[PDB]
Write a protein that binds this ligand. Sequence first.
Ligand code: BEF
Ligand SMILES: [Mg+2]
Length: 221
Amino acid sequence: MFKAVLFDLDGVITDTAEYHFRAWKALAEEIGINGVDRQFNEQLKGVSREDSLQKILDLADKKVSAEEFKELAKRKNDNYVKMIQDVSPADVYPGILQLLKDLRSNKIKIALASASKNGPFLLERMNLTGYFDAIADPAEVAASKPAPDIFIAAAHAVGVAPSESIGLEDSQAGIQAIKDSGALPIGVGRPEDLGDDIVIVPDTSHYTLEFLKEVWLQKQK
Ligand code: BEF
Ligand SMILES: [Mg+2]
């Protein structure tokens, strides 16, 4: 049986989108730019801070200096840190808490393989820290997803080879990283987005220990 589960954070454990939305909306209002609504922020999913800021300035056809741009990006991050203080166990996605409990009670290792530089804090806010055996530090990988670096690091940090592990991901780049690490991917979402050659569940309530075990056994035949 698999010895570890490597968890992505955003789109698997929780969603940070509302908090990023709040942060951009606060910044936009401060500098007097209309149009930063929930719909607009949906289009920033997966998009870098710098590219996102440019999209906000584009709402007002606005140009700024390199220094001003840097300062605005910093201010957005300061806003985001404020907004995520309100993260709580209510933010945890369905099924995830029960899965973490079942993995730990069965002595299966649990690691975080997230791009979030606020991962440890977010886990603390959601009361999940005690379930995690390791957190792979994104600041430490030479290459981001789809590079497998972060999943390899997560597996190694809990004393396992990636080949002994399952990775859970909501993004196509994430699924690729899991595949190229040697771990077994189980995606959450749709094949149109993630690919047609992996096991996918429609939402996280399907991520049960029983299901993960069935998939593991089915995949080594
Ligand atoms: F937290 Be993962 F990188 F979406
Ligand atoms: Mg994700």
